[PDB]
């Protein structure tokens with residue numbers, strides 16, 4: 001079982017007040033990441049190709065560049081697990097965080113593609129999640145979900161040993177074209193979104209409601 005709390009140790013940078021400085025610094029940062037993170041480098045190079053193919057079929061937000069696009073395609077890829085881990089366990093040893101640039105671009109990508117829109121999404125896991133009664137909840141790491149409860153419950157993501165999250169999010173982003181699917185109706189949720197209403201039902205169902213945007217514990221850490 002894993003704990004569900006306010007994710008006090010997760011690198012949750014929202015980059016308030018440093019977007020301009022980051023867009024200028026992140027490119028160098030990305031090189032540093034690659035030098036210390038072979039897996040990321042591979043994931044990114046492949047993601048880059050894919051993005052070249054996807055980019056022409058549609059128009060993106062002003063400022064939304066190849067870094068944002070490549071970062072997002074990559075997240076829907078296999079690099080997601082390690083990245084999520086590194087973020088979730090940031091405070092546990094911030095010295096070995098080699099996703100400084102990745103984190104920023106992915107965070108920025110979602111912020112740029114975002115609107116006021118809220119969604120009813122579902123998320124399945126094969127690991128039991130226990131809410132430790134903090135009063136509110138944040139995933140900490142970025143977290144994928146699906147508009148379809150069917151997907152979330154498929155043998156792909158869920159099992160009796162796990163948990164089914166029924167989430168009401170307003171910072172989540174529908175990123176169909178970016179995914180490798182595109183049939184899982186993925187909605188990407190930033191780890192810093194806060195759910196003011198938490199409710200466990202049965203042994204493996206958790207409802208998260210009253211989403212709200214709050215300040216993060218970290219801000220412009222690498223700016």
Ligand SMILES: NC(=O)c1ccc[n+]([C@@H]2O[C@@H](COP(=O)([O-])OP(=O)(O)OC[C@H]3O[C@@H](n4cnc5c(N)ncnc54)[C@H](O)[C@@H]3O)[C@@H](O)[C@H]2O)c1
Nearest residue numbers: 002076081084122123124125127144145146152157184186
């Ligand atoms: N999960 C879903 O319901 C769902 C739905 C649609 C698409 N996807 C897709 O999922 C991808 C994989 O994302 P994911 O859903 O597996 O997230 P993820 O891989 O983090 O989830 C798997 C698990 O990863 C590690 N983990 C996650 N949170 C943890 C925590 N708080 N503490 C300790 N370990 C933790 C644990 O093993 C956790 O059980 C891509 O394929 C994406 O398109 C997932």
